[PDB]
Amino acid sequence: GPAFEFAVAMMKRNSSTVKTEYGEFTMLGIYDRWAVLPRHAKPGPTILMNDQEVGVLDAKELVDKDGTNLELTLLKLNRNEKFRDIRGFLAKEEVEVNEAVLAINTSKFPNMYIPVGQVTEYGFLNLGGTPTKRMLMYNFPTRAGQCGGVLMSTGKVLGIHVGGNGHQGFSAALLKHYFN
């Protein structure tokens, strides 16, 4: 119940619906004009945010100290409004929890919330042939188009949904240091 209340408030305050040339994604604003998308969203010089064109001033595809893919792209938007700073809800390390909620918001899945149960720090995964780390895993009936979804528990934003196979979903952990 608490994970849901937290999720709904978080999505209303910090999320938006984004379209890049590669698809439609849920997108979470973190602080200032920095937001995050699954790396495969591959933003271009402009994105569509809540159906409006927004320029992308900078983007960083995150990899670790050894070049290993983290499957996240940070983007700095050409936008006047600032995101409410939610860095305090981002952990310093991968978090595991017993009950999480995945929140999605796109024209395909508008304002939908899914109770996904346990989240485990899985770590290494070969994603489409791409070696990837810091993966969090959970089980629920997956569907295409959920990428970008925000994974949360009470008082915590654990990660961003980057893929799913059958009844298995996975998020890139959303760590505090990625935002300083």
Q: 119 — phi, psi (to 5°)?
A: -115, 125
Q: Which two tokens stand for residue 143?
A: 């569907």
Q: 67 — phi, psi (to 5°)?
A: 75, 0
Asked if residues 71 and 162 have their Cβ atoms less than 8 Å apart, the reply is yes
Q: Give the technique used to solve this structure.
A: X-ray
CATH (domain of 23): 2.40.10.10
Active site residue 147: yes
Q: What is the spatial distance between Cα 30 and Cα 11, in angstroms, rounded to a whole number?
A: 12
Which DSSP string do the residues of 82-115 spell out, in sequence order? Answer: PBP--GGGB-SS---EEEEEEEE-SSSSTTEEEE
Question: Which of 28, 62, 83 is the C-terminal boundary of a domain?
Answer: 83
**From the CB of residue 82, how many other CB atoms can be counted at a distance below 10 Å?**
11
CA distances from residue 153 to 3, 48, 110 in whole angstroms, order as listed: 4, 28, 20
Residues 6+ apart with CB under 8 A from 32: 82, 83, 85
| Annotated catalytic residue within 71, 93, 121, 167 | 71
Domain check: are 61 and 131 in the same one?
A: no
Angle (nearest 5°) at CA 62 between 43 and 167 = 80
| Annotated catalytic residue within 24, 94, 147, 161 | 147
Q: Which two tokens stand for residue 158?
A: 């654990």
Q: What is the spatial distance between Cα 17 and Cα 50, in angstroms, rounded to a whole number?
A: 5
Q: Which two tokens stand for residue 167?
A: 């009844």
Q: What is the spatial distance between Cα 159 and Cα 95, in angstroms, rounded to a whole number?
A: 9
- What is the CA 59 to chain-centroid distance, rounded? 15
Domain check: are 4 and 88 in the same one?
A: yes
Domain check: are 123 and 55 in the same one?
A: no
Question: Which of 58, 83, 108 is the C-terminal boundary of a domain?
Answer: 83
Q: What is the spatial distance between Cα 66 and Cα 17, in angstroms, rounded to a whole number?
A: 32
Which DSSP string do the residues of the chain spell out, in sequence order? Answer: -HHHHHHHHHHHHHEEEEEETTEEEEEEEEEBTEEEEEGGG---SEEEETTEEEEEEEEEEEE-TT--EEEEEEEEE--SSPBP--GGGB-SS---EEEEEEEE-SSSSTTEEEEEEEEEEEEEEEETTEEEEEEEEE-S---TT-TTPEEEETTEEEEEEEEEETTEEEEEE--GGGG-
Give resolution, Å, one decimal: 2.0
Classify burial at 149, counting beta carbons within 10 Å of its beta carbon; exposed 0-12, middle 13-18, buried 19 or more.
Answer: buried
Query: Can you give the residue range of the structural domain that contains 104?
Result: 1-14+84-180
Question: Which of 64, 83, 102 is the C-terminal boundary of a domain?
Answer: 83
User: Which amino acid would we find at residue 148?
Assistant: G
